[PDB]
Paper text:
The plant pathogen [name] (P. stewartii) encodes the protein [name] within its EPS synthesis cluster. In this work, we show that [name] is a glycosidase active on stewartan, the main P. stewartii EPS biofilm component. [name] has remarkable structural similarity with bacteriophage tailspike proteins (TSPs). [name] is a stewartan hydrolase and produces oligosaccharides, corresponding to single stewartan repeat units.
Numbering used by the authors:
A (entry chain F): 38 to 149, 167 to 736
B (entry chain E): 46 to 149, 167 to 735
C (entry chain D): 34 to 149, 166 to 736
The structure:
Amino acid sequence: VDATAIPKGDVPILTPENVYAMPPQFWQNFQGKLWIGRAGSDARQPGNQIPVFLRDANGNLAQITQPITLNKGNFDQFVKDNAALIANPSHAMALEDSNGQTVFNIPDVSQPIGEIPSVDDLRKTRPLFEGAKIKLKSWHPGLEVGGGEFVGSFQPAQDDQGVIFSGDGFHWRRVVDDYNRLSLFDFGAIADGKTDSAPAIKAMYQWSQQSDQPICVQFPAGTFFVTGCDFGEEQRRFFRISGAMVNFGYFPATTIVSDGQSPFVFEVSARWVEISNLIFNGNTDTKPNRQGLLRNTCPGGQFFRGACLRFNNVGGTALSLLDTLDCKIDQWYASACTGDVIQAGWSGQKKGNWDHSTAIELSNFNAQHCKGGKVLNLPRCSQSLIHNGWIEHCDNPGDISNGQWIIDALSLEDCKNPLIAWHSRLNTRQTNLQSGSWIDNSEQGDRWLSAWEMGSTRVESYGVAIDGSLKYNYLTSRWLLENNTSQPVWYELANLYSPTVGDSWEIEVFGQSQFNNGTDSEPLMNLIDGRNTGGRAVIHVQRKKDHAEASWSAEGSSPVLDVRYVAKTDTDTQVFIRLAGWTPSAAIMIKSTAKDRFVTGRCARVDAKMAKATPDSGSHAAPQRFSLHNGKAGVGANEQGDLLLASRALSADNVDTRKPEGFVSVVINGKTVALPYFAIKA
Amino acid sequence: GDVPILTPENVYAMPPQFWQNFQGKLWIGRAGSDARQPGNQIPVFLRDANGNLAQITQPITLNKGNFDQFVKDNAALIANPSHAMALEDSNGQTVFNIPDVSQPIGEIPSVDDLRKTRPLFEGAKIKLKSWHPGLEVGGGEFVGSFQPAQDDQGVIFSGDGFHWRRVVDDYNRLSLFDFGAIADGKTDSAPAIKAMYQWSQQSDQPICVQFPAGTFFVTGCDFGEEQRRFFRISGAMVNFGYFPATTIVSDGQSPFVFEVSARWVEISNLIFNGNTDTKPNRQGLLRNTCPGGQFFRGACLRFNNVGGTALSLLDTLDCKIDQWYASACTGDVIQAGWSGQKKGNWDHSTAIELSNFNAQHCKGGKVLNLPRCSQSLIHNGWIEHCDNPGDISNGQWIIDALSLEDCKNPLIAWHSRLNTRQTNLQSGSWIDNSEQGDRWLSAWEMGSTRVESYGVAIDGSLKYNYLTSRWLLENNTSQPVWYELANLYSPTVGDSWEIEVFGQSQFNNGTDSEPLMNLIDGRNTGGRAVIHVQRKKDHAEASWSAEGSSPVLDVRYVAKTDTDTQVFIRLAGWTPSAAIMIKSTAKDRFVTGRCARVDAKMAKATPDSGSHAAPQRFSLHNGKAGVGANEQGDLLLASRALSADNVDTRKPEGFVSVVINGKTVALPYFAIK
Amino acid sequence: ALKSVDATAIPKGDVPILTPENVYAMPPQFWQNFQGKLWIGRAGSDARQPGNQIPVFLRDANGNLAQITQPITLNKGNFDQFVKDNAALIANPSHAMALEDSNGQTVFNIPDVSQPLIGEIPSVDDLRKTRPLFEGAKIKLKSWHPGLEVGGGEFVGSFQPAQDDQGVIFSGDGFHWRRVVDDYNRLSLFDFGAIADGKTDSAPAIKAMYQWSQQSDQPICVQFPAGTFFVTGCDFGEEQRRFFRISGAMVNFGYFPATTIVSDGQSPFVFEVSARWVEISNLIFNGNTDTKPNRQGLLRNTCPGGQFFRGACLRFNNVGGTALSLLDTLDCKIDQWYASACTGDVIQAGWSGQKKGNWDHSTAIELSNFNAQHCKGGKVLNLPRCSQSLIHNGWIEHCDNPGDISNGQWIIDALSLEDCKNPLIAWHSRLNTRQTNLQSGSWIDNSEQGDRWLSAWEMGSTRVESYGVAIDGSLKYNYLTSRWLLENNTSQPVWYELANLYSPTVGDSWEIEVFGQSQFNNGTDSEPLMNLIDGRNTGGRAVIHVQRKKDHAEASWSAEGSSPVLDVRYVAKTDTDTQVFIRLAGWTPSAAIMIKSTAKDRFVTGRCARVDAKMAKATPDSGSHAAPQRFSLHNGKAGVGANEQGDLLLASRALSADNVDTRKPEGFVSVVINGKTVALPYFAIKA
């Protein structure tokens, strides 16, 4: 029979692949009768057989009489000849064995097992009928990975290299129980750390985008070689990439390795990105390169989610984000990275004012021995947070300049250069700085925001530093002293440690002696021992060239009668006060010029004792003096008990000495007297 | 008590190979016996459609012709349910030989057909293709039983005198598919949810209710009012955090999609789309009304177009809601109330922790309806373009990194004990922490503390070991040095600054080796300079005083702007450490954006010619009498003027020992008559 | 068929190649129905062909051997006799094997069973006794233990040597079966022979799965399925390893894990590990100390030179021993953990180094989202010398000893101690705290008792509360301002009510500083100051003193420079409460209210000091008490002041006329008295 003796639209319905794709027992043992019949009826029935043509590899096109006898001999011959059965794709098919038992009876193959070794063979194996089930042993020949059950179809579907495998006028659909349990194995990846799994990653991403499946790129456990993947230009909504989903906090079960040729292993443009449970070994220690893990190119708002990420020997920028709206990177470790680790920039697009990054939360991270680039390349990060982070033996902790950062429990240890935080609005607790490490929060370089927005607050166990305003309801003391007794009592206030020669302390004993009514019953005549409401004592202490010395003043109804001091060392000064009788509550409030713990390690201390203690023999009386002036004239008092006065001394020659010009009412001691003054000669 | 033992559904169950080909012999004998045997055969009756009971001589011949006819007449074989049964195949082989079908392949398309198929024997296995016909979902392997078990619509499917139990390798891999839910976002999956809940309660399995990935239409599920221990509801368990792989839609008719009453509640990995934007309604997601303590756990939740209260909680002992998003919700989002109609016992909520959330374009309702929340926390939250950020009044809140942008009305925080850091207020948004409305606790509990980068505001007490300065100036030379302290920005006319230069000049011993005679230049311990700066109608003017051994000899100022004033000090020789401590009446960053600044220079710099000298003055009085000094170098005195008439003028009454300038001297006073 | 052969006459290296287990291992349909012929031939040949058959010996019940004639006839009768006689076919383990049915159709044709249908086996006991038919032969294990249908799966046979690991490899005499594992992360202790009955000791399974994961370098380590498991003390001690992971059923249950461990109390810890990295998650441990008292904890890690620890979703019920014991911790995260009625320590961490260097502390301890209830006899937290450490949102209620965090460095947010018998011991501990909730006499002892680990210079705590701030250390700021700035852009003085002062104790002193001045007109540097009160001056303030007396309070106020205040009145109508009014001067553009107090704050007492700020325009009631205008600057002997009558007060040593030269004033000094520059006279003192 000839070439154009074949009906229009007739196709090969059975090939050697159909012999291979049925169990060995069937090939070798089966003997029976095959009927290719008219569609919509039993093919064994009379006048139902449609034309069938045997075609050799040579190009033979002989018509074959039905039923077609099947047996090992005819199978062997069909395979050897690389032959094919051509007939109507719309056909009935019926097979019975040597006896008469119907194996199958399909009236229309277009309308509703055996094993296949590879995808290569699957794409060349036509289904027997619409719904025909097959088992794929493995994606690649004899790797025992990326296999599963497959349902055959004649309907047109494009090969996606994972779920749909298409041949000439047919395809096989992977039977997927849970779509969220597919991996790169299903898309033809191999965990040998050599075979490029980039085609599998590109195939699985395109599949997820088209079929709208959120799992996206899913790595199974093991090591994967990946060449640069550019999904670039086109803005997508989602790019998710996750390693083996197991609860391993430290070491993910998936590792990525590359050739260091692309600037990033993954080049994406997506509004929402999620990357987790991955180790990236950049191999920059042995084959130096500039290859990072992921860059997001999408302008006008990015959302990022990182979790359980290890960057080992990365020469490039590990993560590069753009126009960040919300970035959460938790449980990430960087070891011996020579490039930037966490980098975020802005498009500069005037609209939405994309001239900064927003809501960066970095938590539970450890950067070790990172030399060359910046661990944090995060300038202009507003409404951002750092929680429980360690950066050790890293040259450049990096840049958080012009930012707004809550920083809880950040540790810098043995870092060559400081964390750059120029014009950065920091709000910190428990910053741990060892081995010469520090944070540079100075006003160097360019300020992004107005001068009015500048300042940072540091809240430490050892004190508070506010580069800004303070306001409170009231100022109290940690130490309230009480003398509910008519007799005075000697207390030891504290031992003052003065780290530097010339350091000055002022102890304000705020509060008065007496709490009895009738202070407005009589006018005050005795300014010292009178009946006035209000009072304080002001003790001055300064570390001198050798040891220290003291001097004290008071106001109103003084809470202190006397103060003595003991200068045991050059740095140490014990301060005692004779707490006046009937002193109900006296608050201890201190001013100091001494360096605090923020400045030096061997810093200023107030070793508070606040205990009843008589000053020992060899204690020195702090002289009772005050001195209020303008550097020319003023008023004071001395320890002898004389009022001190200072003013321009006068020549008697310029004074009308004849008699006082006038008088003014002054209450000298207890008595209202008349203070005289003389006229000044013109 | 004979029953139908075989039906048309039994012919359907077995492989199609069997129907078409199988020739054989079927025996039904008495139990505890091989039925293929003389004297073992019990009577078997053939029921037909509109047909008599009749009887059939065993063995029962099986072939295509018989099966076709048997199915045709909707026929059945009637016998004693407790029977022996054996099957041969013309050849005389054994397919199965069962002495008793009472105690120890096939595919079935639907649960409808499964509930109609009687098992051949106890432990007979079949495949369920799908829960619903031709839907490829909710299927599995089932082991048949004659024992009486009730249909639970998921694991056990019951007929008349039989049931089918699902083989479950892991109970935590069951979904609503297995209980007959359809992920088409139209067919009501409420029967499946109710069925899976009832199952999990009775079987005491903790997974409770578990959605697969996809969209599900759910009519209101009211889980009675009786108090349960647990209610867990979860969408597709895949690590996302942004968009859960499970969406819920509804008809908006119930007040909540889930009416629960449990001590411990878990919602996670769900999007609820309320559809108020198109079909206005008042349907929330979940309300828990279990009294006497509640525990809540929310994670990865999206609320889109919710008209009702998204979450309603009662008598909360502990509530954690992390990674939750609300867009275009017209009702309340996070709502928590209490049972106690009077104070004492159940009159508040405890341990509310909201973290990593974003409420956007929520108009009408309160995003946070959380009054009287004690020991509570907010961490990294954003409320943008919302009418009512909500109510946290009479609360106790740690608030880290809360953002309010373009919110019409303030976050109501009346009498609320706030402890805040890095609050971002943009586009006229603010927090009302005032004392309006009812105070829940005592007046002694009130107060908030706001720690910002730009300053600290304490509505309460402060105490510290000692006050130091950010700026310590040193002059370890004999010669005075001109420093520029800072530039002061005074945003309002009249704003007053006072720069206390704490510390003294000189640090040599023997200050208490002689009495103080010269109050200015004497061997003294202690000292300070007090520089006063006020912004006047035009520019600023200054003046300054000192105490003891002054650290400052001179003060000059440069004021070439209404707002700006540079302050310079001539730091005295041998000033080993001088601390700069400032007071100001000027508005800080909490009040205004164009706020007060101290631009610290603290650098050696001579005043630039045009600088004006700050007069050396002090003034201590009561408003009637006092003492002072002026720049000329004169002591000032103020007191009541006396008439010479009222004074005994001829002789001084007495004297007092006064040290004038350097010398001890007698100060006179005349008597008044 | 019947050729009697001696055991000593059987070729060296010949073994039982087929046993009754091989008949039981076939599908039941095969046993009953199959009829055919079996060939055992030389390795590398078709065993059916002439001159390829090797000698096969049938062993009988009594142990006798006869060489059988091939082909070997297979049928139910022969299968029954073979099993009934507990018979075996002995031949060369290296052999070809061929099976035909009675028709002559080949089932197998294997030229060498050592080079690469499917039966079922009830238990591993039976699996270890079943020799594979050939290399790569597939079998289906129903379950690990007979009739439990857990720990079953698909197995592929081999004659290659492999040691039994009791989970993945099950070996017999010259063969083994390897489990088909698609995902090694889906294996559980069921696969290693554990039973979820809470009675049968699953220690062997835990030890087996552990040693497998170590030898195989699989990070999953020990994975429990859901249920209650009985575990005797497991010792993985002495040998220093990298990893120890142990986890219960991995399903997101927030509150109650689906896996419970229960033990006998005989070991000090259920798990004795020595690893650098440790992960415990999703486990309830019921110590049963309430009914059978003991000192058994859950886990101790003894690995020296740095330990990492991650804990999540852990419940400790009735634990008699130390629940968790860590050594030389470098990083410890314990999130979502609960302790109920435990009599021992719960979270314990110590160090190895005796001397004050190297390993003498713990580092980066982060305890979060925890709740300890009714724990009595031990420390909930036994964590001395914990540096760079954090507590976030934790409750300790009705526990005798909240524990020891002394000599530490802690951020503590939202810690609640309620009805705790003893304080949390935090001696010399560097605390940085917010929203600490202490109820029913619970407290934190942050005193300086016992040995201080670090230097005196490192000491101090900061407590930031809603009601106030307490700094045991330095404070510095750019400038002090006020919550309250009062304005009077008006030539007339205006009355304001500042606040109601609540003084909880008799003798409590308040000082209200009204910082700022009256006037803001230029030319204060034009004239020399002559009138110290009303003169053109820059700077100023009013200082208001208020003290609670035996009954009510009384006041008194002084001023500086250009005073912002003209008058002060007050209302003391109770012992505790004092309203303060100020007559704010004309043209005072901004006055900041700043306060000092001796009164006890909220840190000290519940009924604490208050400033009930009003800061509003209000004229004081005619019955209000006027505050006397006074100041008083002295040294206790001499000084200066002013009284409300408007007289300057001076104090100094009195002089007798006899020691004064009354003749002439010795000299004069220039003094500006009431604006006018005059000469203040002075007399000389006789020697």
